[PDB]
Structures are given as C-alpha cells and as structure tokens.
Design an enzyme around this catalytic site. Sequence first.
Site, short mmCIF file in Angstrom:
data_model
loop_
_atom_site.label_atom_id
_atom_site.label_comp_id
_atom_site.label_asym_id
_atom_site.label_seq_id
_atom_site.Cartn_x
_atom_site.Cartn_y
_atom_site.Cartn_z
CE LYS A 46 -3.45 0.42 2.99
NZ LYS A 46 -3.26 0.26 4.48
CB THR B 235 5.24 0.68 -2.06
OG1 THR B 235 5.91 -0.01 -0.98
CG2 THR B 235 6.26 0.53 -3.23
NE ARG C 270 -1.19 5.63 7.75
CZ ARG C 270 -1.27 4.41 7.62
NH1 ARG C 270 -1.73 3.79 8.58
NH2 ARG C 270 -0.88 3.95 6.47
N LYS D 292 10.38 -4.26 13.05
CA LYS D 292 10.93 -3.56 11.85
C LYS D 292 12.03 -2.86 12.35
CB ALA E 251 -6.23 1.76 11.19
CG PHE F 51 -5.99 -2.00 9.50
CD1 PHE F 51 -4.87 -2.27 9.72
CD2 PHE F 51 -6.89 -1.37 10.80
CE1 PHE F 51 -4.35 -2.43 11.18
CE2 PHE F 51 -6.44 -1.95 11.85
CZ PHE F 51 -5.12 -2.40 11.97
CG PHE G 245 5.59 -11.07 -5.84
CD1 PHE G 245 6.43 -10.26 -4.97
CD2 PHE G 245 5.91 -12.48 -6.06
CE1 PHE G 245 7.39 -11.01 -4.09
CE2 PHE G 245 6.66 -13.07 -4.76
CZ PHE G 245 7.25 -12.45 -3.96
CD1 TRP H 294 9.42 -2.50 -3.13
CD2 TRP H 294 10.56 -3.56 -4.78
NE1 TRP H 294 10.70 -3.21 -2.71
CE2 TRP H 294 11.10 -4.04 -3.43
CE3 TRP H 294 11.04 -4.61 -5.86
CZ2 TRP H 294 12.19 -4.69 -3.36
CZ3 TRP H 294 11.84 -5.44 -5.52
CH2 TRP H 294 12.59 -5.49 -4.36
#
Lengths: 557, 555
Positions: free
Chosen positions: A72, A74, A95, A106, A274, A302, A382, A410
Amino acid sequence: KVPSDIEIAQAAKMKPVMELARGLGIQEDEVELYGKYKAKISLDVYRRLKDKPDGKLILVTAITPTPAGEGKTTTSVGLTDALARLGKRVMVCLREPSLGPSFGIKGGAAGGGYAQVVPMEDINLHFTGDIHAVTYAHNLLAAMVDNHLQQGNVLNIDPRTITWRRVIDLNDRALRNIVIGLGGKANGVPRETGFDISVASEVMACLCLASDLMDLKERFSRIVVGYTYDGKPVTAGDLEAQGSMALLMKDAIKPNLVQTLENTPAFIHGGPFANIAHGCNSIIATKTALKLADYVVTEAGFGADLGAEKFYDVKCRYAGFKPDATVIVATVRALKMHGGVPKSDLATENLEALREGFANLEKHIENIGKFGVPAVVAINAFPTDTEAELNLLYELCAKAGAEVALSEVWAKGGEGGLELARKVLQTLESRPSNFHVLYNLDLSIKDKIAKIATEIYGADGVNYTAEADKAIQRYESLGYGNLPVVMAKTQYSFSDDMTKLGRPRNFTITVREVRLSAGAGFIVPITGAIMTMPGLPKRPAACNIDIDADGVITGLF
Amino acid sequence: PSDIEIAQAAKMKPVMELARGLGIQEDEVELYGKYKAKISLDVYRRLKDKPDGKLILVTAITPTPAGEGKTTTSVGLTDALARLGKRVMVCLREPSLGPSFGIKGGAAGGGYAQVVPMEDINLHFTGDIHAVTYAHNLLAAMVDNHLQQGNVLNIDPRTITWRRVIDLNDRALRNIVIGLGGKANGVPRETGFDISVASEVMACLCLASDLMDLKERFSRIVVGYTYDGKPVTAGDLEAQGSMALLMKDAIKPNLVQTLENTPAFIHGGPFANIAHGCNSIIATKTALKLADYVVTEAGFGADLGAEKFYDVKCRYAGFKPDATVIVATVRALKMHGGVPKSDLATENLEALREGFANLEKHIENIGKFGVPAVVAINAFPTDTEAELNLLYELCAKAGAEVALSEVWAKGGEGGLELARKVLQTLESRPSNFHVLYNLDLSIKDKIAKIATEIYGADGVNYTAEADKAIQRYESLGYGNLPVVMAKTQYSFSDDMTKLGRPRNFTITVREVRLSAGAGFIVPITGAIMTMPGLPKRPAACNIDIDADGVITGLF
C-alpha cells in the site's frame, strides 16, 4: 537487480526542503527547518490560501491484509512520483510511524524499494518530535488527574473509574496492567491503570482531526478522563489541563515537509491506530496539501473496510473533503490466500483460487462505490505471478467495472506507476465523484454500527454483550449519541473472525465493549480484544542493532 | 521588566552566523529553526590538537531560600568577557520539562543575564531529554521482555534496580507494581519511575567523550542480579547498540546564545546529588577548542557541584581548570548568619559576619584543588553599602580576589569588574589543579576524605546495609571508582538545619548505590527525592496559549 531498502534510501539524492517549499509557494518565514531535509510548515499557509480552490484528492487503500502483503504505502509514493513525472503538481500525505516497532520487529521504509519517502532513519525514530509531544501532553493530563486525587479530590472522581491511561512509544507488555500510587499518603492514591503505545493515544487522534491549535485545545477540554462517585463525567476541561496540553503541542500541530526519492514533496503528520481510531494522517496536512497542489495522494490504515470507511466517514466528514478517486491495492498472492492457498504455496499458479479470492477485492470495489467515489485497482507486481494469473485478474477487475493497472513502482519507481497514474487521470477527467458519507450522525449508535456492519462488512447483523448495551445506553444519555462510530475489529477479515478470509457470508459481528473518545469526537465499539500495547518478540531487533564509530547503523532494517 | 519580557525583546542572531564566526563550518551545524542548532562531534575531532582555551568554573556558596544567582552570574561573566573583546563561550545544563508545569519555568540565568530562546529551552528544546527517556525506558522494556521470554540470564525480578523514567513531576509513579494480568502480560514486579533528568543515561550522556564511549558506558550499566547474586548488565541484554542509536543526535551539543548574542552551549542536565551536576564533557571540550575562554557551572554549592566537577568531570576529561568563581549574596550569607527569610530586608552586619564562615570554607575548599578562587558578590538592591563593604573586606581578609557583579540589572557591563579580576587571575595566577583523591583508595577512604577535607566533618559512620553494600561492590570489582556523595545541599553536614560552617559533627552513610555505566559509586546520607511531585495549585492549571500564539502562566 533491486538493492535493499535502506541501501536505496542512503543513495537518495535529496533536495533541501526549503527549495521544495519555495517551489510550492510557501514563504521562507512559514518554514522551520530541522536540518536541511525536514521542515515544519506554518498553519498560516492554509490560512492565507483558504479561499483558493482545492486540488484533486486521491485516497489509496487496499484489500483485506494477509500474510502475503499487498504494498500500500509503496503504491501511494509510487503513484505520487508517477504523477510528478507526468508533469502534475502533486503531493503525498502520509502517517508518521511509531518508534516502537523499530526495536521489535521492523522498522522499514516509508514505502519500499524505489518508492520511498526520506530521510528514512529520521522518520522512523524521533523525526521532528511530534510523538514526544503527544506522549507528554497525554502523560501531563494523567499526572494532573493523579495530583487531583492527591490534593483532596475536590471533583470527587472515583479513581476506580478512571479511563485515562498513560502512554509510551515502546512495545512494553509489562506496562499493560499496573497498580500505581503506592507507598503511603505522601505518594498518591493507589489505583489500577496501565500504559498504551503513544500512537494509540486519544491525543494522537485529536491532533489528526484538529483544524488548528485552538481547535486542538477545545478538543482536549472535552476529553473524558473518568467519573465521579455519583457517575457524572469528569473532563480535562474540569481539571484545566487543556492549556498546558495545547502548549506542549504548539510545534507538533505543524505538518512536516519531506520528500520522495524522486524529490516529490511530501507531508508526514500524525499517525493514529486504525481500529480504535481512524487510521489517517492529519487533516492539517491534507488540507494544506490541497491548497498547495493540484493533486493530493493520501492513504489510510488497514483494508478499505476499516481505513477507507473511516477516512470517508470521519476525516472527510470533519474536514469537508470530497475525494475524487480511490485506488485499491491488491496482489495476486494475497488474493490466492483469500481463496484458501496457504502462505507456503503462493508461488504455484492457481487460477481457481485467484478467481475465488478475488471476491475480497470485488467487495472492496463495491464498497468504495457506496461512497460515490470511482475506484481504480493497482496490482502490485511480484516476480512469481504468471501472465495467465495477471490476465485473469485484469479480466475480473473489468467485469467488476473498475479500471486496473499493473504497478511496478517498487522496482522502477515512478516509471513503474505511469500506467496507474494515467488510469487515475482518465478517471478524474471522465467520472467526477459524487461523494457522500455512509451514515447520518443523528442515527442511534446501534443503527450506525449496523449500517457499517451490513453495508461494508456484509454482516447479517450485530450482537451486543450486556456490558456493550449498558455502555451505549449511558453514552446516549450523556449526550454522545450523535457522534461518528469507529469500529475496532480485526483487519484480517470482513468479519470479526480473523480466520474468515475472502468474502465470508452468513456471519454476525459481536460488539463486546464500547468506549468513548470525546476529544477526538467519536464512539468506539470493540469486537475482540484489541492490542493497544504490543509486546516485544523472543528475539527483538533491539539485540541486533548497532552503530559504529563512523555512525553506520546495522540491524535496523 | 520580567525575565520573559526581557527574553521576548532580545534581538537574537541566527545561530548559523554565530557558528561560522566561531569557525564552525556549515555542514557541522544542524538547525532547529533559526535560533537553535546541534553541533557535530567532528568539530572536536578536527580541532583535536588545536590548543584548549582557559577553563572557568562558576560555583556558589551553600544554597538557601534567599537564592545566590549562580547561572545569572555565569552568563553575565560571559557577556562581560565578550565586551572586553575576548573569544568566549558559556556552557550550561538543560532544565527538566516537568517544573514548567509544577512550580517553575525560569530563565536560563536572570534579568539582563540570560541564554535564549528561553521558552524552547524550558520545554522540548532540541529533544535530548526525550532521547534520554527512550534510551532508558527501552532498556527497562528489554529487561522485562527478557523475564517474559524464559529469563535465560536467570534474573531475580525482585532485585532489579533499573527503574523507568518520565520528565514530568508525578508522585503517583514513585512506587508501582507492573507486569500484571497473567501469563500473557509479563512478570509481576515492584518498581517505579524517576524524573528523566535523574536517569543514569543522562549522567552517561554528560560523561561520554563520544558516541562509542557512550555505547560502551551503556553496556556496563547494572540492571539487577541473578538469583545467585551475580550482576546483570545492559551489555548482557545486548541493549547498548539500540540505546546508542536513540542518542545519535542527543550526543551533539546545542548552540544557542546570550541576550547580547554571546555564544552558548546547553547540553545535558543531571542531578547534583545522585550525580555530578555538570553539563556535558562534550560541550565544554568543544567550547574549549572554539574559544579562548570557557565559562561553565555545576549544580548546588561548591561542596557538591564544584567537588564533583573537579573529581569526576575534570578527572574523566583530563581538564585542568584555570580559575573558579564562587558566587555569593548578602541575602544568602545573612541566612547562614541565622536571619529568617522574612527579615532579609533589614540590614544586619553581625549576622553577615557570622554567615561569611560558609563562604570562607568554600574558598578554602577551592584552594585544596590548586585552583585560584575569585568571589562574585551578586548585588541585590536590598543590600546596604556598609554590608557589601563588610563582605568586600572579609573576602580580602580571607585572602581572595572579589568583585561586585550587577549583571542582573546592567548585563555584560554589570560584569566587567569581575571579568577583569578573572582575566587578571588567569594572566598572572596559574592554577595547580589536582583532584582530591586517587582512585586506588578503598571506598571508605575516599568518602572520609571528602567528608573531612571538604565538609569539615569529624568523620563518617555507616549503617550495616551500607557496609554490606560496600563490601559487595568491592568484591565485584567496583572499588576503584570515584565517589559521588548524595547528601543534602543546604549544609556542609548531612543535617539540613545546620547552616553556616558546622563543627564537631559526623556524616552517616545510610545506603550505597552504583552507577556502573556513569562510572561511579553513590553513597547516600538520607532520602533523595528522584521524582518530585506537583503542588496543590500547579502552574499547568493557569497555563494557556491563545489564537495568536501568546502564552500565559508559564513564567
């Protein structure tokens, strides 16, 4: 080919943000630098541009999240860059991440690969200090509540009814359930409480929904912290905390100017949950961006069932926005998961499971239509997807009445977004939106919950525990029944059962608890346990993080 | 006019200009707005061998309710030297955010001797205290996670000494129970919070030479013991890398300025009882390369602040202070005489004579470190010329240089007399600086030597638990560290009612703690308040900020 994400970000050539700002028509005196690659912009910009027309507003959302991932943010950045390459005057609003996940699992780019916002390290850590401001405003209020008890409890608060917890921006499960005020009469009043993660703070939700500093202050004064022994609400305004809270937030109220890898300007401002909140960046950022740019790309947390619904029904409702288009991000692998393929077997072509899982995407598409907004599907490329899978997916999207584009941002940055951007521009030119919120505020709380559940989730209906019932009845009595509703539900299913992937039918939602965020201005019905303070894992990233004499940082990403 | 009003009317220079004029390059400066900046540690690296300038410590007599205006004098002395054409910087501590919402909110200094922007200094400033808070609380979260994940190191949760922090005055967080709710939510244990500026991490920041040293310091922090009594460190939990990352920016000192645009650093702000009470080594050592004269200070009276400055800060850094200014007022020495706060408006030569014995000991004390002392009487419009004169005289009879300082009222010109004695003391009175004790002494020897030589005590007593605590720390290889006495600041003795220069008394050590990361041992003579509370009517209640950005109730 494609290097790592933090490798990409290091090689980025950033422009000084002051050049980007003057480029947008922001004045030098409206810019407060934090180094040369971050700045805070004054709310005077909005004020002096208040009567200019708004640009086009493009929300980015996604299908129901899955272990496969959908890409998302990205896509958001990538779209933005593509629009910029097509000569458009554009900004993205995003955000700010919580600091905590960096030390747990992360952190990661704001975006990914060749679609990122930078400087990455700063964004993930302290950034411009907004989350510290939120933390301290929040904790100042708690300190004041406790002091009030200590000093004779003139307002006659029952301490056992206090709902205002504390916060810290770290994943610390040991602070979920605590007892404070121990040590005898010099040290406070014994009571049960705990910490939430700072980004879950109602203060954060307030920041993201406020129009200006004075509005933020007002909202602060309306925050309910607990009840008296007779059951009357007690507010921050009652404790006279809102002025100090506001003061602590006097720089945090400004949005932060940064940029993409291709130097397209970007705002990062606020970052609420969210589920128990609306999962958007600040109104302040988005409204400023809309005066400065002809095109504004933003996103919500989300899937579209949560983030998009709340973007429309809370943020847009408060701000007076009318979104022009919405992009729904999906992947082949994620849709196969929604059609019953386990994570371990997602590379194997399976057209039948893809067809079945598309029901998830189809329902999100339908739902976006219910707000009168035209929808465009972005398929995140992908390597393992087959042509046959992709072509089926395109045919299913067209059958559903939606434009669709393959996105390779990407790998290829803005170049990878050109087909998506053009489909978006064709949509903006030929299908004007007819935006409207899903529900009127004067419905009862139950009626509002049921509209959302039945229309968006596809639930048959909604059941309530006795505790949820009593809470609703009290809130309606106290005069909070005409507020928006913010459903706190698993993101992993349209239902409240995280194992029901795809497009489940014949199910009911169960509201177990209902809470009030009187400052942010909404009701929060809760369907399962919500993790407002996540914990660290067996092997936290913190153990592997280092930084050497040259300031090179390992283990962070 | 009020301190804030003075502060509002300051014509501040952009800090970049000050930086280049100091010979700092642009790429070594990181702006926070026009009027604050962080300075890179490469300024020290590249000027490693350029010579150090002169080092001036500003301390004070024993504090009292009368106030002695130490910071005011440090800033005023700095503006004076600037006026006399010298290349000068002042270095100061960062105040806690908490007091702003409780009682205080003050200028950095006072009247016409301030460092600005006053308001940002008092609040978030450049974020260094948030970095401290997070580095500290991460370690705690990691300790707790370690317990939850099987307790591989076999920590006894009930021995954990690492508390959490927050930079607000919140008494309800002093004593808490965490880890409640079951298998899923941690391990129940007793703990609490301290104010963020009390953190060992803050003391480490202020004593680190560079970020890699700060990291190594972190790794040595002791957070608790195993069930067998073995120390467990932050190094054992692999926390130090993450803690150092969180402090990546806070390790750089902050360039601001005085009202008259003299450059200032503000960096760090530890406690002066359970720690040494100085601004960072990093700021002072940088200033020392950028300027011919560096003015800095230490918390509390000369007996705590100055001693710790000489015996901790200069020891770790290898500084050799060239002069030390002892600040004093007439109002204060009067109270050391016995005059209650309420009658300080009267004159009283006999009580100012008796009170002088405080100042006299401090002066003697500075001289035991081989540093040339210089007295500054801080002039208060209540003071009578006969009073001042009696003081002038007394300093001169006790053998020390002294000047009158009217920097509060007159700014940098208020301080020219002082700054001429300082310069005169530097030109022609070379210090012979030396720490008070060798690190090789036992712990009890080092405390005894501070207690008898600096506080003038007959000796020192120990509780059984302090004995036990000492024996163990020595057994665990920590007996070669500097001692940092945690004591009341309102008397050379450990009893706060004893003002003046009390004789024929003893210091009792009740408890002893360890700061293995900061690099010191902390003997404690009575309860130390490490989390102050809000008052009955907090400043927060009257703070407000209006649509135009004007702030009220804050100062």
